Ligand binder design. Structure first.
Ligand SMILES: CCCCCCCC/C=C\CCCCCCCC(=O)O[C@H](COC(=O)CCCCCCCCCCCCCCC)COP(=O)(O)OCCN
Ligand SMILES: CCCCCCCC/C=C\CCCCCCCC(=O)O[C@H](COC(=O)CCCCCCCCCCCCCCC)COP(=O)(O)OCCN
Ligand SMILES: CCCCCCCC/C=C\CCCCCCCC(=O)O[C@H](COC(=O)CCCCCCCCCCCCCCC)COP(=O)(O)OCCN
Ligand SMILES: CCCCCCCC/C=C\CCCCCCCC(=O)O[C@H](COC(=O)CCCCCCCCCCCCCCC)COP(=O)(O)OCCN
Ligand SMILES: CCCCCCCC/C=C\CCCCCCCC(=O)O[C@H](COC(=O)CCCCCCCCCCCCCCC)COP(=O)(O)OCCN
Ligand SMILES: CCCCCCCC/C=C\CCCCCCCC(=O)O[C@H](COC(=O)CCCCCCCCCCCCCCC)COP(=O)(O)OCCN
Ligand SMILES: CCCCCCCC/C=C\CCCCCCCC(=O)O[C@H](COC(=O)CCCCCCCCCCCCCCC)COP(=O)(O)OCCN
Ligand SMILES: CCCCCCCC/C=C\CCCCCCCC(=O)O[C@H](COC(=O)CCCCCCCCCCCCCCC)COP(=O)(O)OCCN
Ligand SMILES: *[C@@H]1O[C@H](CO)[C@@H](O[C@@H]2O[C@H](CO)[C@@H](O[C@@H]3O[C@H](CO)[C@@H](O)[C@H](O)[C@@H]3O)[C@H](O)[C@H]2NC(C)=O)[C@H](O)[C@H]1NC(C)=O
Ligand SMILES: *[C@@H]1O[C@H](CO)[C@@H](O[C@@H]2O[C@H](CO)[C@@H](O)[C@H](O)[C@H]2NC(C)=O)[C@H](O)[C@H]1NC(C)=O
Ligand SMILES: *[C@@H]1O[C@H](CO)[C@@H](O[C@@H]2O[C@H](CO)[C@@H](O)[C@H](O)[C@H]2NC(C)=O)[C@H](O)[C@H]1NC(C)=O
Ligand SMILES: CC(=O)N[C@@H]1[C@@H](O)[C@H](O)[C@@H](CO)O[C@H]1O
Lengths: 1128, 67
């Protein structure tokens, strides 16, 4: 029987039997609320699994041999599942968590498929690569969590609570003490237009409660209780959130609303260093790991005559160009679809549709009968063409016509980049097919794990997870919705559903599973991304001329014009909505503007007479300056000689905001960075066209599926979708009930009603900032003009799933692929070695590299004293500094174990330990100064310890005083934590982290230049919006503090947008033009009337900014990763 | 009289000096007779005096240092 066991084990039939077994068990696990009909299918499954385990044991056929075939790491899984099944079969006791363990079988797929186990094994190694960088990032996250803790400890608890504590409540229990001030959230103030407590602050920057509401700290808890910055656990959670950018704009707005606008500095340090740089180096170490991994490997005459006739037809096909143009025209034709087509236009569209079906049928028949039917049986391209023909034919006798768009893809033959996107989509299920399969298995496992662990809780505790009593739009009861939750988490939106699951299930289990799916799923998604990437690869005339040449070549003149453009930029920045408030500066800046026009046109004439129209106009930045001065001169001459205040008066002067653009011509950093940017426009453009066509496909599909199905008819009394089944069924129905004008049939802001609005919705979905209301109104949609039913058409979520996949994971993949291609090409063509560094920045790069030499000086001289020699010999052992670092880590932990309103005795003990620690550090400092003599001047970590010792001794005294009108004065003790870098240098084990941080130091200047250009862009666009978007109605993303009404507010909004965050929330109040949201005439502090935004210029502004900032930050990432590859 | 370190208006600490002669005069000014150095944890060095009536204050803890 031993030989039989062996010969059936090596046999391949029972392996596929096991495969089908696992897969059917999968289809049964993914089933929720199964009938008792199934209670024996699980018995059969246990029988088959136990049979397989038997076969294995017999196949080895001994005691130590059976120990060898259970020595395998995977077979432990089969043993565990069979014993757990026997457990739940034999005896009860019942905790309902053992029934969850059935998901462990789905992992057996990894063991039965050939490369699956190998893929997962090679993936585990990536975690062994990520160990040191994970230590590094948890170190930084903890440091920044301490910073944000001391900064906003119990600050998010601030609430705009109605004023209280009136008079003699015996003692203070008078409200008409803490009992009411806490149980009175109805007496808190909720942010208008939302359901969210309104924060506030002492400082003279933060939110401003209206009359009848005062600022306090008597807040029950944060939004759900999981965002507070006190209790360093919660602060570590919040900063992991800020590092993954998940809903980070929300925490940003809340904090700035509570503490004060100055702390945008903290948030921008976190975003531009924690989020940006740390996420980049995580990605870079994963990419270096995977790079190393990839490196690891009827009659004869009539028959012959008609054959020669069809051959004479064949010799002149001349169709590829004509057929291609017919394809392009067919797409262009279907694109002319929209929401309200008149009946004759629909008839014309359908006529052209039938015409093109006929054309392609003619082509198919001519091709199969003319060249060879067997060749068109062979060549896969023509195979899929004929498939499209058959599909169109089935259509002509919804999704029926949605197959026509596949015809677009044959343009790939003439379009090498669309063919590269095709290569990528093919490799997705090709060389990376088993990796995609790992991903699918993981998403399945996690969906069913979450559904088992959380479905009963989701269904029973619905009341506390949804306001209008119904299901939540995201849950894990079904398997489709659990797949959707796992998808969301894969896209980066997990905190907003983790809050739900923790409010339903509980902190511990939900936190565990959601952090696990975040880490593992994002890891495998990153691995798939990176794998796809790496797989896709008289005399007075000349006298005056000489004088003017000396002037223009005079350094003082250049610095003068620099000062002048900076002053002009400031003058721009002084253009808020408060100029009517201050009449003097109005005229001051008027004179200033005239002076600017004069000096810049004078510089223009001077450069003219110095260099001449030819050698002047041969350059570009001078052309730019010429354009700007021309705009200013047109403005001036139109302001002087009337004929203004009717045409492009202000509507034309707002181009003044282009004034800062003179900076880039002169600052040596902006100029080289823009030279790197424009030098890749010929490579961003073709790829933007590929993405435009590939999103044209999806937008036409969305016009087919959704056009007209987005209008929702809400009454003015409420504010959201009227009855699903009844009340106002159709648009033609809601108008029948408008007998009172309370009801409006309004489309959703961003919809599918054209190819343009389709492009807008596709961008909002592909950036994942706004795709929530898109998907909601799209799946809710049932009829062409009928009210959307709360969850009908549920499987249209698959549209956005397949879009997000192709139009984002693959289009962005093409983006980054071609960007890497173009930049690796630029690296060789560039005269220098690496871009983004000026000559002086290059010099500083070389000098910092010469500094970063690991060769120290001589060890130490001898003090020649007996006692001093003893102290030196005891002070200069490695173990001493180990004790010192243990002390500083204990101080760190002492600074982790405090919260707000902790305990008075606790504050006393903590202060005592603070003094005790500064005493220990003064002691080690004086002992190192008495080591021999030279601690004061030998090493840099020693002088760092010295200066922090001095500052700590200074600390407590002014720390008493500067708690207010300043941040927490104990914050300065966090600097002591920086000393762990010394032992990080003096250890031997963890060494890649050293090179990582040094590469950050190397990439700091490039990031400086790029962020300087980004600051300039934020500046230009903030002035653009302060001219344009001022007075816009305050709505979803544009608050009473995040605004365009000033320059501070505009810089705030611009910064939050810079990371793509919340830009849907800023756009959505721009677009709304008309009632009931908007109004007619309005008395503004400025002549411009209308609290609306121009949809044209609004979409232009926001989309162009999204794309420009996207390219800029991708070049930031590029500099970072090219340095990380140089140090590789 | 109340015994303790002398605050700084309003709710703060005063400051000591390397000698018992620094703040003796300060106790004389607010109504203090004795004088020597003192230490308030969390707020820092002050100067301790006695025989201070309730018309003047001492180091009161809990709110903040505000002047
Ligand atoms: C893109 C990939 C789309 C994958 C989602 C397919 C959804 C199919 C589906 O909903 O069937 C689900 C069945 O689940 C499966 O078949 C598991 C598939 C493996 C519905 O389950 P139920 O509502 O609990 O009954
Ligand atoms: C090549 C571009 C062809 C565009 C095209 O043919 O669209 C035609 C008109 O296009 C337009 O002019 C609208 C904006 C075009 C921007 C390009 C037909 O559209 P319509 O809805 O029937 O016109 C109604 C008047 N509002
Ligand atoms: C590795 C494995 C680590 C397992 C950690 C188990 C932690 C379970 C904590 C727990 O008490 O779950 C409690 C019950 O959880 C269960 O039913 C057991 C779940 C077993 C999960 C099996 C492991 C998943 C396999 C992957 C409920 O949470 P709570 O205490 O009511 O939350 C209230 C907080 N406000
Ligand atoms: C993976 C790691 C899973 C770690 C799970 C730790 C168990 C947490 C359970 C727990 O209750 O800790 C709670 C604190 O846990 C948290 O809130 C977040 C913990 C941060 C873990 C995130 C670390 C990110 C890893 C990268 C205690 O909250 P509380 O202040 O006592 O308030 C209770 C009622 N609101
Ligand atoms: C190397 C280039 C260094 C860049 C140097 C100066 C950039 C010019 C920024 C314009 C300053 C605008 C002044 C301003 O916002 O006043 C309006 C008041 O704005 C504020 O309240 C604070 C503005 C912060 C200054 C932004 C820089
Ligand atoms: C290196 C050099 C970098 C600079 C290169 C190019 C900079 C080009 C800047 C173009 C800015 C034009 C934006 C703009 O404001 O034009 C706005 C265009 O007005 C529209 O409605 C646009 C109509 C939609 C057409 C779509 C394409 C826009 C074409 C304009 C560009 C006019 O603004 P306004 O409504 O008069 O606002 C006045 C309120 N006080
Ligand atoms: C960089 C390219 C950004 C181009 C944005 C031009 C949008 C101008 C707004 C517009 O013409 O639509 C205004 C009316 O809005 C609509 O009805 C359709 C809006 C079309 C927005 C197209 C957005 C393009 C997205 C780029 C994808 C990458 C007029
Ligand atoms: C040694 C460390 C034991 C920390 C126990 C401190 C007692 C206070 C409870 C506590 O853990 O603080 C809570 C937070 O403390 C921590 O999170 C300490 C975390 C230490 C983990 C690192 C271990 C290596 C909040 O209160
Ligand atoms: C904004 O600034 C004002 C002015 O300093 C703060 O007013 C004071 O705040 C405290 C709490 O921080 C209020 O409560 C007091 O607490 C102590 C200790 O429990 C108690 O002995 C007092 O009788 C009182 O209950 C205090 O009443 C309040 N001052 C007044 C005149 O009402 C305010 O707290 C600051 N808000 C924030 C959010 O920081
Ligand atoms: C839009 O919805 C209305 C509301 O049902 C439908 O029009 C008719 O409405 C009456 C009102 O009860 C029904 O009795 C009829 O059965 C409806 N017509 C049909 C054909 O069923 C119809 O679905 C839509 N009408 C229009 C004009 O679009
Ligand atoms: C129901 O009636 C109201 C008013 O009778 C309509 O509101 C008007 O909507 C148009 C749409 O552009 C505006 O131009 C008008 O200014 C609005 N009038 C107001 C606000 O008094 C409303 O559109 C109607 N709804 C439907 C579905 O027909
Ligand atoms: C600070 C702010 O935006 N406050 C507004 C308030 O003026 C307005 O009345 C209310 C809607 O009724 O919405 C909120």
């Amino acid at each position: 029987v031993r030989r039989a066991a062996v010969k059936i084990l090596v046999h391949s039939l029972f392996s596929m039997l096991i495969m089908c077994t696992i897969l059917t068990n999968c289809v049964f696990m993914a089933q929720h609320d199964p009938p008792p009909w199934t209670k024996y299918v699980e018995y059969t499954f246990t029988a088959i699994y136990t049979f397989e385990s038997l076969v294995k044991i017999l196949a080895r056929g001994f005691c130590l041999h059976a120990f060898t075939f259970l020595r395998d790491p995977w077979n432990w899984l089969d043993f565990s599942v069979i014993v757990m099944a026997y457990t739940t079969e034999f005896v009860d006791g019942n905790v309902s968590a053992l029934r969850t363990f059935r998901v462990l079988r789905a992992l057996k797929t990894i063991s039965v498929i050939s490369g699956l186990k190998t893929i997962v094994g090679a993936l585990i190694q990536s975690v062994k690569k990520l160990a040191d960088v994970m230590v590094l990032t948890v170190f930084c996250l903890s440091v920044f969590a301490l910073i944000g803790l001391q900064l906003f400890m119990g600050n998010l608890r601030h609430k705009c609570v109605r004023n209280f504590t009136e008079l003699n409540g015996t003692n203070g229990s008078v409200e008409a003490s803490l009992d009411v001030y806490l149980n009175d959230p109805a007496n808190y103030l909720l942010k208008n237009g939302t359901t969210d407590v309104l924060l506030c602050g002492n400082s003279s920057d933060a939110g401003t409660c209206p009359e009848g509401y005062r600022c306090l700290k008597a807040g029950e808890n944060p939004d759900h209780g999981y965002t507070s910055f006190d209790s360093f656990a919660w602060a570590f959670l919040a900063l992991f959130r800020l590092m993954t950018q998940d809903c980070w704009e929300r925490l940003y707005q809340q904090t700035l609303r509570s503490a004060g606008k100055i702390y945008m500095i903290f948030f921008m340090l976190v975003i531009f260093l924690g989020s940006f740089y740390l996420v980049n180096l995580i990605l870079a170490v994963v990419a270096m790991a995977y790079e190393e991994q990839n490196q690891a490997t009827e009659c004869c005459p009539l028959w012959m005559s008609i054959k020669q006739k069809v051959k004479f037809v064949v010799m002149d096909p001349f169709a590829d160009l004509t057929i291609t143009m017919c394809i392009v025209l067919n797409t262009l034709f279907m694109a002319l679809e929209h929401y309200n087509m008149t009946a004759e236009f629909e008839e014309m569209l359908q006529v052209g549709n039938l015409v093109f079906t006929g054309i392609f049928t003619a082509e198919m028949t001519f091709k199969i009968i003319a060249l060879d039917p067997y060749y068109y049986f062979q060549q896969g391209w023509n195979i899929f063409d004929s498939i499209i023909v058959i599909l169109s034919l089935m259509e002509l006798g919804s999704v029926l016509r949605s197959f026509r768009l596949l015809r677009v893809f044959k343009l790939a033959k003439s379009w090498p980049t669309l063919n590269t996107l095709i290569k990528i989509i093919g490799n997705s299920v090709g060389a990376l097919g088993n990796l995609t399969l790992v991903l699918a298995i993981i998403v399945f496992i996690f969906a069913v794990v979450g559904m088992q662990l959380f479905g009963k809780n989701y269904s029973e505790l619905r009341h506390r997870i949804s306001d209008s009593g119904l299901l939540p739009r995201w849950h894990m009861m079904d398997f489709f919705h659990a797949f959707l939750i796992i998808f969301r988490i894969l896209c980066g939106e997990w905190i907003e559903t983790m809050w739900d699951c923790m409010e339903v299930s509980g902190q511990s289990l939900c936190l565990l599973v959601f952090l696990l799916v975040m880490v593992i799923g994002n890891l495998v998604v990153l691995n798939l991304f990176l794998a796809l990437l790496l797989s896709s690869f008289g005399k007075v005339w000349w006298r005056l001329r000489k004088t003017c040449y000396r002037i223009v070549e005079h350094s003082w003149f250049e610095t003068f014009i620099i000062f002048m453009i900076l002053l002009s930029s400031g003058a721009l920045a002084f253009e808020d909505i408060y100029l009517e408030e201050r009449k003097t500066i109005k005229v001051l800046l008027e004179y200033a503007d005239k002076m600017f026009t004069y000096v810049f046109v004078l510089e223009m004439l001077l450069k003219w007479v110095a260099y001449g129209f030819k050698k002047y106009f041969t350059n570009a930045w001078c052309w730019l300056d010429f354009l700007i001065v021309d705009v200013s001169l047109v403005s001036l001459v139109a302001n002087t000689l009337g004929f203004a205040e009717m045409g492009p008066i202000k509507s034309l002067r707002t181009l003044r905001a282009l004034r800062p653009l003179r900076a880039l011509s002169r600052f040596e950093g902006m100029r080289v960075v823009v030279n790197a940017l424009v030098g890749a426009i010929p490579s961003i453009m073709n790829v933007l066209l590929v993405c435009l066509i590939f999103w044209l496909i999806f937008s036409i599909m969305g016009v087919n599926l959704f056009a007209g199905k987005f209008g929702r008819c809400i009454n003015q009394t409420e504010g959201d979708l009227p009855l699903n089944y009844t009340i106002v069924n159709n648009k033609s129905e809601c108008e029948s009930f408008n007998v009172t004008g309370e009801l409006y049939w309004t489309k959703v802001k961003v919809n599918f009603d054209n190819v343009g609005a389709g492009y807008l919705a596709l961008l909002q979905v592909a950036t994942f900032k706004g795709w929530m209301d898109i998907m909601y109104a799209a799946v809710d949609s049932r009829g062409y003009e009928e009210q959307p039913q709360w969850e009908d058409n549920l499987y249209m979520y698959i549209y956005f799933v397949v879009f997000i996949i192709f139009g984002s994971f693959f289009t962005l993949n093409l983006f980054i692929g071609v960007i890497i291609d173009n930049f690796n090409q630029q690296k060789k063509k560039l005269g220098g070695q690496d871009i983004f560094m000026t000559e002086e920045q290059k010099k500083y790069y070389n000098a910092m590299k010469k500094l970063g030499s690991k060769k120290p000086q001589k060890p130490i001289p001898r003090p020649l004293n007996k006692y001093q020699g003893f102290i030196f010999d005891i002070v200069t052992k490695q173990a001493f500094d180990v004790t010192i670092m243990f002390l500083i880590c204990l101080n760190m932990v002492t600074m982790m174990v405090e919260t707000d309103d902790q305990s008075p005795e606790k504050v006393n003990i903590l202060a005592k330990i603070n003094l005790l620690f500064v005493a220990i550090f003064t002691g080690e400092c004086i002992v190192k100064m008495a080591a021999l003599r030279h601690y004061y001047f030998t090493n840099s970590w020693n002088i760092f310890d010295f200066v922090v010792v001095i500052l700590s001794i200074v600390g407590t005294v002014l720390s008493d005083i500067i708690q207010k009108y300043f941040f927490s004065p104990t914050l300065f003790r966090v600097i002591r934590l920086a000393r762990i870098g010394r032992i990080l240098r003096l250890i031997r084990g963890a060494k890649g982290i050293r090179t990582l941080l040094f590469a950050l130091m190397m990439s700091l200047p490039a990031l400086f230049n790029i962020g300087l250009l980004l600051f300039l862009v934020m500046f230009i666009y903030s002035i653009f919006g302060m001219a344009n978007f001022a007075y816009v109605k305050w709505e979803a993303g544009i608050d009473d503090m995040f605004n365009f009404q000033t320059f501070a507010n505009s810089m705030l909004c611009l910064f939050q947008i810079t990371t793509s965050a919340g830009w849907d929330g800023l756009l959505s109040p721009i677009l709304n033009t008309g009632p009931p949201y908007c109004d007619p005439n309005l008395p503004n502090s400025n002549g411009s009337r209308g609290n609306c935004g121009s949809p044209a210029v609004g979409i232009l502004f926001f989309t162009t900014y999204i794309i420009i900032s996207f390219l800029i930050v991708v070049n930031m990432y590029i500099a970072i990763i090219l340095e990380n590859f140089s140090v590789a | 009289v109340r015994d303790g370190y002398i605050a700084q208006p309003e709710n703060c600490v005063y400051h000591c000096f390397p000698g018992s002669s620094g703040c003796d005069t300060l106790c004389k000014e607010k109504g203090g007779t004795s004088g020597h150095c003192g230490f308030k944890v969390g707020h820092g060095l002050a100067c301790w005096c006695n025989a201070l009536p309730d018309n003047v204050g001492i180091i009161v803890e809990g709110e903040k240092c505000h002047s």
